[model samples]
Target chain A: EKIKLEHGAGGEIMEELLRDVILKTLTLKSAGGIGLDALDDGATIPFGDKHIVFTIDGHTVKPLFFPGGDIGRLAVSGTVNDLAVMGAEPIALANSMIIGEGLDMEVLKRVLKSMDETAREVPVPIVTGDTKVVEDKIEMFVITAGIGIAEHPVSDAGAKVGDAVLVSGTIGDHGIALMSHREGIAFETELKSDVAPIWDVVKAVAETIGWENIHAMKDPTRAGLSNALNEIARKSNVGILVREADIPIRPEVRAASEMLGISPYDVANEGKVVMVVAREYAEEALEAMRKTEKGRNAAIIGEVIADYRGKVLLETGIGGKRFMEPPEGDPVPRIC
Target chain B: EKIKLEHGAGGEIMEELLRDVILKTLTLKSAGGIGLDALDDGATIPFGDKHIVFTIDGHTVKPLFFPGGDIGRLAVSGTVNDLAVMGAEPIALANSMIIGEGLDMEVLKRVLKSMDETAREVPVPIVTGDTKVVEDKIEMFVITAGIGIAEHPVSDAGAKVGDAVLVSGTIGDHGIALMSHREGIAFETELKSDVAPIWDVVKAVAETIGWENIHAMKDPTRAGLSNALNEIARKSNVGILVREADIPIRPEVRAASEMLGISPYDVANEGKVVMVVAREYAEEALEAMRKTEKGRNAAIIGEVIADYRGKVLLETGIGGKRFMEPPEGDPVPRIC
Candidate 1:
């Protein structure tokens, strides 16, 4: 089959191809501790006394500018969050950029300024960079690489039998914000992308409560909350149950997703975090999360269950439980 | 002014933009010892007693495949070489990719396989990656980041006045190979890219006579030898003098350059190293380089002199001298 946008959507199709095909053809030996097969937000290389967490992301969000953020903001936050979810503290970043010739000077400067501002806001310095200009027809693309430090990284498969699933703020905000301008769909009030660096909030939570109490964390990007939960379930060898009423979604985002025949749970998120916490410390973890502005709307969306291993069960308001299979492909491609 | 392709050509124009326009607006702080100001192949961060060399490069080569290498090979080799030149042993790599929607499966596999093979040759692993697919039109691009270790990282400013210049092999092989396929111009025998991993060769040379004896090293890529030498001279505040006859160019490459009205000195080389060695260890360094396959064709091309600081003088075959300025841009674009 020909490669499609879905292959990079971070869902089932992407998963199968990476394992059944990509991994099979190439011999991969992670000079570090973790590599592709784990499918974690970031990989780790054992450094002296601690581990160095590494992650890279390429941002091609079309139009470059959206309601809440731009490509450069997404480029930096996207990478920082990958490290954050793996329980690593971001330390440094490097960028590789490909831009079109004839790009307006002000526009390039604006984009770069956002990247610079974001890096300083996160307080992680951008150490180095590369730039290459192509023909005028090509669009701009930025690939961001991040290095983080972690005493011990928490992978995607660390949830215990009895654990609480926490979501930092509303779901699907980023995807809806992107599609609004992309599809030329406007509302009475503009929907903003929930694009912000989550490292501070993450670090705050880790400091408030011991990091050990947090079993696993994920940023529901590309394939969204449903896909993330499903993968965690499969990997952790446990089941997840989400109460439909608990998932926090903004009114505008809900309306937009419905209007576009999309599920918010299947839309990408850049500013939210999905965490699985030990049952004993779930309350304190929730308190810690709510203390941060980014996680102020935190809610308990689900929990680890024992039945239907490797599956996610959603409790509907109508008193029925349905399986939440990962979306096959995202119609809203390249949102991040 | 709009960003022209020449703005990223590793020449005078690019330097102006990075320092004046780019840096003036954005605030960038390099966390470790080396940052943008050094203008070296890679940046270094002191890690405890040792140092970590970091570098990122994005590949925009057309066709993805050529006579002797592919984009995967280009991506891996490019970053590894950056660290190699800085006297660092490349340890790991991370990739960020942007591709079109309709790329073929076999083609992707081939590219990845090439990356895998090249990584194994360098003995450095491709540890982590991120992939994003753009609209069906954009050409594939691979942005790679590499991490390497060194006890004392070497910067471009180390070349002494009494130093000898050395090149591992023939220059312009890569650019010629790309244009041959991309421009659809065929010669009697196909020209192949000299894209091979040079870390082993660099390590051998370094270990044989110690890294301290090697003043500076560079991979002549993009705006080729002219640009590389010019930058080292400008940065180290020294003068570089090269004899035309000593610079190696294959017969076919020279013919193609003349046919295309391109200067071999401005064409990129993928696998060669142009080094400035201490005058005392010049003979041993050349012998050590020639002992490795990648450097078997090693030759002394020039000497570092104490005249015309911040400039490079090219001596003609017939005993005339001329100034060599860095190029504007490659007329044949996307030649890696």
Candidate 2:
């Protein structure tokens, strides 16, 4: 049988493949020691005076270069978001690039320049890195690992029953933009990538309402909001209910999603956050998020529900409730 | 011009290519702050009470499975050796894998299982990871980043004149083994990869003689002892002189190198450490290393000299001396 690209799409199917073939084969166990689970954005290890949160992510986005961002920016932002969502203040990052032979040096420079600017914007130094050139076939892939310090402890498994779900900005911008580019379905207005640093917004919420009130957080990059919410719900053993009207969806993004026959909920967003905060502090958290440039469109989209444990339900505009399941197959390949 | 596979080989040419394209283009200042020099096996970051050392490397050796070890074992040991040579106690690691669409799941599982067992033996957890699937054109690649605590500081620039150079074990075993497999060279005994964890040996040396007296350390993986010596000489601004008769080279490795028309000095060694220690503690360090399982063939091969600065000179068995230069091109491709 021939292999399909969806198999590596970083969605439910890919996760299942890893679990069935790799994790189960190795009899792996989750990290349950420090209240930091392996399923979260970053792992917090006990260090003197504070906890150190480290995360590693791989970027295999096709075309290497994109409209608003490239693999280099994605590499930095991907790792930085991992730290931010975990309530960690990103301090430094390490980059490693494995380039295939014959890749243009000029293109690599542009990517590196983007990485440098992104790192500077986040106020973290790209401390060290490794660069290896490989055969042409493997040239486009880049992997980045970041280490940050959690100012206040946090975990995705910390969500409570009364917490509210909030997203920083419009959903599906990144995914729709990439899909539009890939499928040659251009809209009247260009769909630019919504890639930016969400560290400031994360820090503001953690500082204003306190980290304890912030139950869990994630950046919906690869699998979009649907996958993020589903994973959180499954991990916390609670249900999340969202109103279709409350979830901010841009006209361009919505139009693009419709053009591709993809749901906005399953489309990816790079520069966004899904924060689960206590209901009492939801307003304050939303206000804190709005203080940042990228979070100006922040909205409280959902609330944690005690009923229908480990499921996500969406309230349609017409007063209809629809149960939302995680995307069973790859929606978009190499979006990150 | 078509790109040759040799360009991707981790040797002097690849290093120069990166320097000309990526490093020079990005204008990345030399890592001087926080003691992060790119010359070391890993970068050292000051994290409150302990210095955190981090390094990321890729395993691309062909024929994934080998006689003594496979890519999985090489992946773990390679990262561990990087931290060990940097004088760090490895705590955790993160793995990122990019597999071709049609790659065998059974082969991947076997590799991961070996990696798990090796990590368990080293007492370091594989804390986090990412997996990506690529199209049929790409080959399977595994990139790993290791994090460790620097109990005692060590750097390549620390080697001073009068320091003694030590080899952990017989050199060129790994390179020869790979060459035999790739080129169909025959041997009376199987040319098994000399890939083994060298942390225990490093720890023993550190404990016995103290880290302050150990000036420099490196694992001669791709470019073998000759290129490693050249790098150390240039970085430390000291001359390195080795006696050919004192250097350890197994008979099989010598035979293999001769048949392949490759310099034994330029061949890779998976399980070896080329270390520089203070002359006063050289004997003690060598004795300590010899006690470890991986270092049974440890030998004091050379010394740092005041003259012939920034150069490596090797004296022949018949007392002829010749300057050893870096390999102009890679002798082995994708040995990793």
Candidate 3:
């Protein structure tokens, strides 16, 4: 059988492809640290009293120039957020680009500028990079790999039954904006992607309420909030109860979701993070998130529950309750 | 102006593209380390007495299946060697692939298997990876980012006026092998890529001569020997005087290069390294290299000189000499 778009869509199918086919080919040993086999956001290499967090992401977003951010911004944020979610303080990054021949120099420069700015915002330096020009079907592809350092590494599997779930900011904005732009759907209020380097917000939260209080963290990127929540539930061996009304989502994003016939929970998000914290630290986490502009729309959206292990339950705001199944694949492909 | 193939061909043109265009837009401060600004094989993050070395490379070689090695092997080795040349002990790696939709699962598995075996051979773990499928024209692109530890990090710019230059194994086998295979030119003795993870060879040399004594190191990959030598010369502010008669080149590779009308020195090699060491330790380094299978063809090819600063002078075997100019760009694009 051939690999399909859904196989890389960051959902159940992608996981299955990785486990069954891609991962099945190799034998790996625990490389002296906590990473790889667990399939976390990023891998950590333990130092004497600290850990080195490393993560890499490839950005092939269709419209290289998107509404809230371009591919460059998305690439940088994606990597930084990945490290941040793992409770690491990003230190440096390596960027590699494969550009298709005949691409305008201006376009490449703009993208590079965006990447540079985004890295600067995170206050992380892009310490190394590789570039290649290909005569293939790719217009341009950007890959960013980040290295971060942490004193205490947080795992997504650390969530307990009494944890509180928080969304750093509005959900579905990135997906909705990109979808609307691609589908040529115009809303009176323009929807822009909430794509930004979120390391500052993460750092603020960690400083406000120690990293150990943050049980689990993940960016609801490809396959969106539901997928991320479901993953956290499964990995943490606990269930999640989310209140739909509490989910911080822009009204324009909600309108766009309905117009596109795609669930907001099943689309991709670039900047927002779904953080699970100890119930005792939830309010503090929310306040900490609110203190940063990137997380000004922060909300306590859910709670971890003992029942329905490895599942997420949604309170749909109309006296309706339903189990939220992880999507088979992302509704919008290449949304990242 | 457009991004042409030459812009990424690993030569003066590629350097110009990065400097005059891509790099001109960013204001990057030294990230408290010994890299980035140097454009060395990798970057180093100083940690206490030891340092953490990081490097990334993007592989988009055509004919994923090539003689001697495939794309997977190339990707793994490329990253490992990048770290090795920096005098680092590779610890872990992150692999990211952007595969075109409709690619065969079997093919991907084969590539993954090759990567796994190569990593295992180097005895490093594939700690994390990211995969994306695109509808673009790329068949498959692989990006590998490596993390290594070094006690005393080596720099490519450390070559001194009296340093002796050595190459691990034959110089042009890889480039010639790929070129012949791509052009459908058959030789009586099959030319296979010299692609292999070379950490073992590098470690041996370092152990014998010590890291600090080894003035410079680089893999003569894209644009091959001349490019690598020229880079060493310019970066070290020294001149490289190479004796053609002493340089190691497979007979088949020499024949194939002439047939393809491409100079072997201007192509790419996967499993080779050019080293500059103190003249006193040259023989010791050569002996240490020859002890490994990968370095069986190791040879003392040249020496660093002060006469022609920032240039390479080739002493042709026919009682003639000429300045070896770095190619404008690689003669065979995508050779890596």
Candidate 4:
């Protein structure tokens, strides 16, 4: 057998590859805390009386510079959001870049500027880094690893029946914008990427609703909302029912996704969070999220149910229901 | 101006780019501990009466498999040695791979097996990871980030005027082997890469001679011993004098390097450590290192001097003294 591009996509195919080939060869799973077996956003390493949340992301997004964020910004924010979803407060980040020869110095400097600016916004220091220059077949690959401290590290498999599912903001904008840009399709209202850091929004909700009350949290990245929700429901062994009309996808994004024969639910989102909160505290979590600028469009979009274990049922606006299966792979490759 | 391959060669040119373009634009440096400005093996983050050593390395070697090691072994050992040199006990590692499409599944499995074996030897779990597949430009880029714990961190800038400089093993084997392989050159005696983890060697030395007695440590990787010694001297504001007769270089490596017009002093060594020890404890440190298999070839190669601050003076085997200048860049790129 040969490896396919879908093997790296964050979908069912990648999950199977990781489980069958990658994880089966490992002996040690966790480092005294949550680890690789969880298949979550990040892992936790026990350090004395505290837990350190560790995660890494490799960014190979095309175009170098995109509509809302560049590779540097995406790399930093992607790492930050990964740790954030695990209830970790980021402290420091390490960056490693592989640059092909003849890369313009100005472009390198501009990327560095974006990296510094994004790191400053998170208030986490870019403490260490590595750089290598390879042949010109490659442009540049930016990889970021984040370290954070957490009192209670959260996992993605804690959603219980009767929980409320809430989204921090609109979905599918990032993937739609990149696809449109790549296809050279122009929309009347510019479809811009929503590739901003959502740590502030996450922190506000966590502080208001408490970490224990927020059972599961994920950032809808590659393979978008459908994959994220499916993973949550499957891992928690519960069912999720989301209302189509309650999702906050923008009009331009919806139109562009339709015209491109893409589903908004199947793409990626850079700055949005899909969270499962205790039903009693769901309203408080939404209110706290709305108080933050990144989460002003926050809404309660779904709920956890006991029937149809490990499945996601979407209630369409036309009063029809259907199962939302995780995609075999990301529809738009390299979107993240 | 354009970025050159030399900019990432771990020598003077790369130093200039990092200092002028990369460091000049950054506001934050350290995360309340040793950080990027030091240009040391790894940065340390203060964690309540303890320090966590954090470091990253991006591996882009040409051949996936080499004489004595593969990319998997190189990536793991590189990260472990980086932490060990900082006086840290390696605890966990995070791997991020960017694979190209159409890669053979068997090759991936082999690499994963090698990674598992290497991590098991170190007893450091491969706790978390990320994977991405881009267009087929890149074969694979394996980037590893390490986390370790240190009671008291050691920096490369602590070599004092009377410190003793010792090397764990013979140098130049790794670079020479790879270069010979790429050139399709054969020799009477095969030169295998010395790419093995040195945490045990470091731990034995630290236990035998206290941490304070050991002033500085570094692995002679890209650009080899000349660059490593020069950086130590420049950072510690001290001078070093070495006798060529005392430095260890294997016969095959020396012959191969000379034939390729590459200086043995300017190539890479994966499984070696150049350490500065207090004069009183230098003999003890050497003895401790010699007891370990990886350090059986360890020798006291040099000593710190009060004169010629920021310079390295080498006494040639012919009894003539000459100043050793750091190379502009690595003669052989992609060596590590």
Best by lDDT: 4
Residue-by-residue lDDT tens digits, candidate 1, A148-181:
8888788889988889999989998988878876
Q: Candidate 3: which pairs clash?
A: A137-B137
On residues B1-336, what C-alpha lDDT tens digit does candidate 3 reach at each position? 988999889999999887787667766624677767788999999887999999999998878998899999999999999999999999989999998889988899999999989988999888888999988757789999999999988888999988899999887888788889988887775789989989899899999988888889998888889999999999999989999889888888888888998888878889988999999999999999999999999999889998798999989867688988899988886787
Q: What are the DockQ scores of the candidates, in order?
A: 0.70, 0.49, 0.77, 0.79
Model 2 segments beyond 4 Å from truth?
A1-4, A27-37, B1-7, B25-37
Runs in model 4 lying further than 4 Å from the true structure: A317-319
Comparing candidate 1 with candidate 2, which one achieves the higher DockQ? Answer: 1
Report the error of model 3 at residue A288, Å.
0.9
* Residue-by-residue lDDT tens digits, candidate 1, B1-336: 687888777667777887886666556657668876666788787777988788899998877888989899999999999999999998888878777889888888888889999998978877788877777476588999988988867777888998999999898888887777666666786889998879887887788879888888888887888888988898888999999889889888888777777888887889988889889889999899899988988899899989899999999968899988877655557777
TM-scores of the candidates, chain A only? 0.96, 0.94, 0.97, 0.97
> What TM-score does candidate 4 reach?
0.98
Tens-place lDDT per residue, model 4, A1-336, is 877889877889989988998899877767889989999999998877779999999998888898888898898899999999998999889989999899999989998999899888887888898999987567788999989998877788999999999999988988899999888876665578888778888899889988889999988898999999999999999999989899998888888898999999988889888999999999999999999999999999999999988999999967799998888877988886
Among all windows of ten consecutive residues in candidate 1 chain A, which has the lowest summed lDDT? A23-32
Per-model B-chain TM-score: 0.96, 0.94, 0.97, 0.98
Distance from true position, residue A114, model 1, in Å? 0.5
TM-score of each: 0.97, 0.96, 0.98, 0.98
Candidate 1 error regions (>4 Å): A184-188, B182-188, B317-319
* Candidate 4: Cα lDDT at A205: 88
